[PDB]
Amino acid sequence: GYDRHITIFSPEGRLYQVEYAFKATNQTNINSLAVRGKDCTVVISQKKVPDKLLDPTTVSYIFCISRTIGMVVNGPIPDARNAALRAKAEAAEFRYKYGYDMPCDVLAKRMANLSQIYTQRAYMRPLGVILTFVSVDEELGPSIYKTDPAGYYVGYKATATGPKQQEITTNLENHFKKSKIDHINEESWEKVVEFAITHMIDALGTEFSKNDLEVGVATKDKFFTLSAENIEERLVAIAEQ
Amino acid sequence: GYDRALSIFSPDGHIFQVEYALEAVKRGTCAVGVKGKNCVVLGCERRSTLKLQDTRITPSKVSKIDSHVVLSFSGLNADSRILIEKARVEAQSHRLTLEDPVTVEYLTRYVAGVQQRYTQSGGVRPFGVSTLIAGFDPRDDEPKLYQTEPSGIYSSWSAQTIGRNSKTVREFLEKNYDRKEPPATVEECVKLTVRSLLEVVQTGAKNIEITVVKPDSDIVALSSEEINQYVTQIEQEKQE
Amino acid sequence: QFNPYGDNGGTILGIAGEDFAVLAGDTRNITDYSINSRYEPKVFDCGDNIVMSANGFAADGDALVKRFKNSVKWYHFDHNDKKLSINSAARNIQHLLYGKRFFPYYVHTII
Amino acid sequence: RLKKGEVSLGASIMAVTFKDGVILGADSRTTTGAYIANRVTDKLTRVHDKIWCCRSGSAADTQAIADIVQYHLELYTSQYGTPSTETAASVFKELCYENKDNLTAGIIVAGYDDKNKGEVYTIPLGGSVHKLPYAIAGSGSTFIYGYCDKNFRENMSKEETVDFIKHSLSQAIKWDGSSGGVIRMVVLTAAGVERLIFYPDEYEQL
């Protein structure tokens, strides 16, 4: 059965290497979440530092692709960094060639097309990662677009990725049924981060310290990550209500 | 580029791809070459499971490489065209640089060298073809007949046959061909060639092709009626 | 426009006897009307009892001698330490020089 | 060294370090021969947040270079963080030096680090790099070598540096036909980035 080793069709029309790349996604055992506000897009992810000898500041799965675009990865770090470096180069080249900042959805499509090539070309393996791109696009506003090893991509009102992704997904679904809208009706990004953390706590059923989380925020004309103290400040506000 | 080594040695010291190329030659229609005192004759079998053929336009079994040299073959027909084309090009190239047409030995050596190159080159299989190359050197009246094979070895023959049931016709030629006295005339040489094919062919109708080559670029192909006369003559002498 | 050649002056002289041979050359090196060095040797022992000088444009002269000295070294490696005969050296040098037929070494060589 | 009939950026450009950082300054004029193709050009251009450059020589060449440098420094930032002004000058040099025969670009690089404060690197036609306290360049700079050498002082204030640039470029404009229009300036400090403009009615009667 060499049809399970490289990216060619099986008798039932399947690509097993692509399917197994999906299972590599959860190898890190980390859950991520993304939501949109009025003026912003917030992304959050679990941060697990098991070894005491590790420098915790260097342990990250969130990346600043361009000034406007941010990316969180679910999957092993080598493949994650591989994808990050390529996305950075693609976003830089786009700006040079076409005279304006690469939109979030366009970068997502580009990376998805690259992922598709690996599912069709034999010598290249798929990357075992799911890439979640976030920004505040100057045309489409707050944006969430997610890529997988199959080469599939789509926009999102909100989304979640990881081992306990389904619990987070339904938690968010039930909120948007209730609110009757496509986003978090909130002015400041600070409270949108508080929403994101609150609903992750409810879905996963765990409490979080400042070092157990990692947060990325996209606003108009800049994407940035939060420090431990920025998150701690945010955790205090949730507890006091 | 496709690099795979297809022709390789086996534990017992054999290159199976070259040997399997010989099996393709063994499948091919029989071809025979007989050289007389002042001529060479190339005989060729044509299988009769194909009726409704158009013999005007169907590729002939014997091919002119130059005006003084001819090449017949046994094995894969498509493969033979590639060797014939290369040989024809080399024939014109030799005239251009040496200001003299190729010798039969030189042309054979070139074709054999091409066949050999395909036995130790990556990404290619050997030619499923053995050839009989015959003719006369420039300003020379000594007849020349050479044989090549997929491995790339070549050699000169007083008379030789290749293809299916070639071991039967080789047996015939080995007792019927005298080294001390070869076929003195054209008629004698053609008759011996037709006789040898009649040991294998079936019917002497549109199954046998004969091509006669004489010195100073004198090559001609026999028609059906002309060949049929040899068939009619041999059978009447046989009933004895 | 950049001119890749120059004239370093100087002169050389070779004479052959019955059982010996001399190769002489002055030690002055110049450009235009200036003296660069009063002692800059341009006659070299290249091994195997072969002496060589390549006079004219010194950069080309040095490059050539350097390449021939290297040719002698590899001759030993490739042919079981065989002594390079003077006639063989001469033919080898021809190929060094003609190798740059279309961008020549501007030198007069004597061995 | 200019290609025939191509737009000429001949200029009056200068960058001056001072106590709080560095200030870039430039005129506004472009010529093809004696005709002023653009009278309101912006010759001060951003390659990074607080790393800018003054352009002179060929308009097309300097633009193409500046666009490439901006691309390199944006990619540098994504991997290694904020680049030094020296790093930016090095990228300019690499382009100017390696393509010295096909290019006519006299560029002044000026930036503000927090560690290194205000820095100025000038890059003439050859592609050489020269780190200086202040720098002048462009067709009109010849006329103000005397003036600028006599009047420049290290560790000046913002208002003094603005006056030094204004008076200098005013003279360069007055004597160089290839220079003119408005005087644009860009201030680089820890505070941020400030754009200044000065019109003929003001600076001519200095």
Place this chain on the structure above:
Amino acid sequence: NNYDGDTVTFSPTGRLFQVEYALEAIKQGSVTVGLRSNTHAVLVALKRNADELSSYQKKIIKCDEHMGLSLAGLAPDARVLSNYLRQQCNYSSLVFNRKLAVERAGHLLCDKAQKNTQSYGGRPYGVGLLIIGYDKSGAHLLEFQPSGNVTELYGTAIGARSQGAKTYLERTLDTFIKIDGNPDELIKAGVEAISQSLRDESLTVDNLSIAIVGKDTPFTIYDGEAVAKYI
């Protein structure tokens, strides 16, 4: 078993079987010994023949006036690697007017052998080398293995039954290291060392091969009647 088809494949225990099979080719090769003092470095090599009618396979190759090696295993592979060393020694002379350090020589060989163990299609080198030389930091002896591993030593030996000579040198370490300014005695110690790897056969005039390099001695090889002194 299933993991020895090519060099690009690791075994479940983390082994490269093709590299190990290349190492095996060295063990089948004829014995050769290397040792040094502070002034000189010596190579001794037992040459092998096909039969009495044949010549004896040459084991020692000169790389420069100050450097050379002895081989054990596939001889053509030693020719490729020795040629590479000759070029690198030569590049150092022409470009930098500098004699190549014996340590750099080892580093260059290591990196050349390594590339052949990480790529598809190619194969590992099937030969072991003992490199001796005298450079600006005195005498040197190196041991090259086609896995890539290069090691600097006082003395060593590679090939069939090389353990006997390697044990002897391990005992004699304190004696032969101090043989300074005496070539013939350092060779004698090397000839006695290789003698501990002999079985049924003894050292004859066209069997033994010796090479030396040192302070005021260029790399030179001794064969034939020139080694009769040491029997």
Place this chain on the structure above:
Amino acid sequence: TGYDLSNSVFSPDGRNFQVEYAVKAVENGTTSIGIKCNDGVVFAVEKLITSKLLVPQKNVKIQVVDRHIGCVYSGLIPDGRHLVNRGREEAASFKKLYKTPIPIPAFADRLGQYVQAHTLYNSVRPFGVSTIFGGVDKNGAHLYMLEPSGSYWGYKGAATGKGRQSAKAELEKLVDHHPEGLSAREAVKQAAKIIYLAHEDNKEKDFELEISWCSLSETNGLHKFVKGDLLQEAIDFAQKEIN
């Protein structure tokens, strides 16, 4: 199955068995460590003395990259050398274009991307080394550890090889007992001790100690080897602790 026969093939788990097999080669190698300190880093390694015939001090395993980065590794030594050769090219092109010497995090990703690239195709073999490296740059001191998969993180202390667990345990104690920080000269002494303690897992052949360090104050931000009196002082400190 057969999923472990070819590199870059995902198993049904989502694993690359060939990379995991390369880790086994690393585990088989000698112990090497890295210790991050106040204003720099310290590297140490175990050199097994196979024979009396090995020249002491003359089989150097720790390698310098540029003038400010130190690299040490465990596993297939040649593979480590190949990685360092690449590192030196990466560092050279960075300094060529950007003038400044390559930052350590920058350098870490250059190796990471290169090693990761060797898990993408079946025509190449994964690296059979875990590499501990780091140095001093504009932002201060950094210590990293890189694995066959391409995975790397920053570290306070790092260890790999046959005695990694013993070394890790000893490293964890230093991090707990010194929250404010460890000095450069102290880290050299500690490095010696940890190698000697980690040698208990490889105690058939006796060994030779080798230490290097980068420090903003002690070495002026450059990579240097520890030799002579400072080396013997560190050895004596380690000898006293085992007894």
Place this chain on the structure above:
Amino acid sequence: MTDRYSFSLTTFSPSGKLGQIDYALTAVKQGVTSLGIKATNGVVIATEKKSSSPLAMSETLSKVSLLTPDIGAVYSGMGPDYRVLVDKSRKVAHTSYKRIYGEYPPTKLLVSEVAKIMQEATQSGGVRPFGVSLLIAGHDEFNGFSLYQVDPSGSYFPWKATAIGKGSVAAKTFLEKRWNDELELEDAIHIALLTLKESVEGEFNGDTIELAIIGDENPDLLGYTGIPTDKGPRFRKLTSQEINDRLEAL
């Protein structure tokens, strides 16, 4: 390193089957149903928008794509494969035709170019076939309206009406009963919606259905005025509202 797969990954089996093409067609069978119907004055192409998640915005994912102003495309099978084919199809329409003749290619020739690309993925080294079947509707001056199907093998056939994917067998039967040569465009849209309701299981509205037409020229969608000969694109994607209007009188 380097792509060492210079050899075919699709080969003939003893029975004469090209396995990878067959398996690619199996992947198309699993795919969601899509269809195309040809009228006298237009063409309609339609498909279901299978949403991966309700949080996902199905508007961002477009199954029906514009290739030229007068040509559109829809698929069944693997979405990613389709997306890159659309990119290549749009480019080839320019490079191999418009940049030569100064006008857009007719439907049949653009289809031919797409087929060529899919055939090469069947024979070239180190690649698998595309796991999709396309339906391409289009108009051009000299051929009028036309509808084509393109399979993983690279084979293409012209259709009066057809369906591909999940429930194609039943859907083709339904179309045989309803199709005639006198159908107006509005009648063809009505039949398309009826045919698609049979295969769709969940919600059936303008937000879950994607439908586009090739019909009359649309000057309002051109974007400029002043050139009489330029009258606008014949390709138009029906809005969510426009679909729901026709679902009431169903």
Place this chain on the structure above:
Amino acid sequence: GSRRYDSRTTIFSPEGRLYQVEYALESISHAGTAIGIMASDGIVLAAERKVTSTLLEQDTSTEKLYKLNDKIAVAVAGLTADAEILINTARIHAQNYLKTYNEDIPVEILVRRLSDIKQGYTQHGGLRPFGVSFIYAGYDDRYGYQLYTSNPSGNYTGWKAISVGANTSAAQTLLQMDYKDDMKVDDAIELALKTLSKTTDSSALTYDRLEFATIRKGANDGEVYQKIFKPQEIKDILVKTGIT
């Protein structure tokens, strides 16, 4: 490395056969039958479409019969996509010859070159062969009317009448029975249809399941005309011979 997954498409069997060529021929034997018959005053090309659907657009369709130039046409049997690759190459080759010599390409030369391309895929490159067999029908001023066939092996032969694809064994026997040398085009048209009508796997032979073409000198004075039959024209010729 990649050696593991190589099918080795261009090798010999122990018996001296080319595996992939043999399997490509097996594929072609399931394709719709195509017949070529050469008369003294023209050539007929007839071909059966593969199981037609009633909703297939028949008039604006091309599956079997393709035009190479004004004087040469081909009938296809096998993978259509493969055939179109080869057809465009053949069309280009014909135009290269015309551009070079200012003369229409001789039929055999075009056939040889196309057959040489197929041969290449069996000897080198490591790719699968083209799963196609052609019947070439054409005219030139040297040999007049000519019929050839080529197959995945790259071997070509000339014919008076020939069939490719499905049921060639049965079809060739019927052609061999009723064919004669002094035959006219109109008679050859009737023979082509009668042969398909008996060898077909369908219930009855109809206009919608056929492609038909002639190459006559039926134009005005010493010039050749290619007629690709329309649906209604096939319907009429089918009634005229009394099949429907």
Place this chain on the structure above:
Amino acid sequence: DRGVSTFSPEGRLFQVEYSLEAIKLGSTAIGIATKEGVVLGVEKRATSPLLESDSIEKIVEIDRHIGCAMSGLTADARSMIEHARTAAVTHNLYYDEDINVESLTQSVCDLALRFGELMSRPFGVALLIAGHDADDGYQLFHAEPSGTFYRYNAKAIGSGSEGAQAELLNEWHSSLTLKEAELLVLKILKQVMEEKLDENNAQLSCITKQDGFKIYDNEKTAELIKELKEKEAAE
């Protein structure tokens, strides 16, 4: 399958070892070196009596001072000879001298291992290279597809090699004349050959300093065959 350049567990290259088996199937070739010259002889082995034996070219000239005999897949030797001839003439062009026999052999042997995944497989032919130069005098070399070459006083290759080599062991001494060597090649060839030895199915050649490399005529060899039979009957 498996790689072309793969090592066996014993430490040998599979393809090189398999090519050596092909050489054992080949026709016999013998070479003997003396102080008066070097003699080269081969078994022609015609597959059929109709084959004109004089066209069987298994002894070949490389230069005036270097000859060559072959055994195994003889078609593979053509490009080896072509290379040798070019190497020999090229060296004369660069250095105005004859090229050493050893250096020529080394040049040919460099081709041997230039195979893998360069050519697709090793050569399936062994060569006996005989010659003379001023430095090392008369020489005989055995060049294998392994890239290895040994110098020999005498050597036999091919199907009857092990039997012929044992015979050469006893018969060879350092004072052999050229005539004695000629007869010795014929004697040993007649012993190992299947068919009966005569002038048509066996060929002799030699290389001397004075006259260079010469292939003997069938008339000359026939007399040496007759001289050989008479001498064996004489005791």
